[PDB]
Design a protein around this ligand. Structure first.
Ligand SMILES: [K+]
Ligand SMILES: [K+]
Lengths: 286, 287
């Protein structure tokens, strides 16, 4: 992973990134450019954009704050930035798919929220029906950028890629969290930020895997299935300590709780016990 | 040798563990899932012999009232834990054979597939300009399908006469599909793991026809929607596909509940569809 930048700027990778970003549509950024205008803009300024990226002279623009229906706050990068973030992710994704845990399902190829529910249900129905529901503050509102770049540097040795990725963290990229309402569809502004959050939280997956914990994770939304109420409280304190001390994230001790499945709301699903099947099952909550 | 592959020690042991893991209600014999190991330790070789000579006779399914989480009940046919054990053993060998044939846009009761993947694929089609949906509703599969027509289509792939026999006997026993996915319920279905595979084998014929016509579709068991670009082509697809389902597959289309509509009038696998103004694209959420 030394000359990774040239793989990102290749003709085929940029063409596929441009097609995916147009297909994803989405609102406009601070420059007001619609996704229907990216084609002619790259045809006239694409080579200059590539040259600016090689010499680390491309300056990403800040994301636009958009209120979306209550209301939801999202950070929308410009369509040019979404195009570049997609070009980076297409190269970084296959590298990190070899490291990621099988029980991580958020914003990954061929993975969705229902798979996480299914795996968690199979764990509950083996006797691990005491749920540790760790609530984290907004990832990109609390992550230390240098902490994240160091973790990325263990695998990515191309400094040009490290430099441009760091700049997009500065731009304010974040995670469209509409999955919490069981919404299915294309997220906004999430070409690169979800992958970055998975690289970070993969350190939590490896720690939980080290301790033999049964868990599923979707972005920064994780639940842990354990066999007793007391070990649940021990796992609760041990993992929350690891999240704050080793990763620098903040555990919301007001929302985090230990509970039975029927008290858990995860990825928009609730949990109930099927008396006929003699198993826990899941369905959307109110 | 296909029968002997189903009756091998490795296959039957995997089938026992999976059926015990699925738990479930008792069949007509009142045997609980925790009693299958002692029963197989006694009559295991006897059942294997009866299956080799086509002498084993499955028990009829038990009509169980399954309480729904939001009130009311569903009626479901539950095979005995012995028959669920044998149905799983058969399905474990037949699944790799038919996974090679199945269309990528079929998601019902398949390994590593789920309803959300069908929704995501349908969303990508709608947002590409195919926002006219053919919503064909089928009468329940296992009280309308012709057993001979189904066994013939199965026979064109499976040539083992001992496997064709026991599969047909399980059709007569009344196996059916747990349709709780229609209420967005996620979890292990009841009623054995053989009937959904049989339904997919039948409806895979429809998948190949729709693919031959270049149609955009997703299918989950017998619940299929087709994404087309215009209203007149939607009515044309509605007429042509409905005729193919009834004439070539012998299934029955519910003309009252079938319709041509736009996404926000469609309810599919417990999901509804809405338009995200800011994202400028359709999305989905539980209805
Ligand atoms: K959580
Ligand atoms: K349908």
């Amino acid at each position: 992973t030394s000359s990774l930048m040239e793989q990102i700027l290749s003709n085929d990778n940029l063409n596929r990134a441009y097609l995916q970003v147009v297909r994803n549509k989405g609102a406009e950024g601070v420059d007001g450019m619609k996704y229907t205008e990216l084609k002619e803009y790259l045809a006239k300024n694409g080579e200059i954009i590539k040259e600016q990226l090689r010499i680390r002279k491309y300056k990403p623009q800040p994301v636009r704050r958009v209120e979306i229906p209550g209301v939801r706050n999202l950070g929308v990068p410009t369509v040019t930035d979404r195009f570049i973030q997609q070009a980076i992710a297409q190269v970084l994704t296959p590298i990190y798919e070899e490291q990621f845990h099988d029980h991580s399902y958020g914003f990954r190829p061929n993975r969705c929220a229902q798979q996480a529910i299914l795996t968690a249900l199979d764990m509950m129905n083996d006797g691990n029906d005491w749920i540790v529901d760790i609530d984290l503050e907004k990832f990109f509102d609390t992550v230390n950028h240098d902490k994240l770049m160091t973790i990325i540097g263990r695998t990515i040795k191309d400094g040009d890629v490290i430099s441009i990725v760091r700049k997009y963290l500065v731009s304010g990229i974040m995670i469209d969290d509409e999955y919490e309402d069981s919404i299915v569809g294309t997220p906004q502004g999430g070409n690169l930020s979800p992958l970055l959050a998975n690289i970070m939280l993969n350190e939590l997956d490896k720690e939980m895997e080290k301790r033999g914990l049964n868990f599923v994770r979707y972005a920064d939304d994780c639940i842990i299935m354990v066999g007793s109420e007391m070990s649940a409280n021990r796992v609760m304190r041990n993992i929350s300590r690891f999240i704050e001390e080793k990763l620098g994230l903040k555990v919301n001790m007001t929302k985090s709780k230990v509970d039975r499945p029927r008290g858990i709301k995860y990825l928009g699903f609730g949990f109930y016990y099927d008396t006929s099947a003699q198993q826990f099952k899941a369905k959307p909550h109110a």
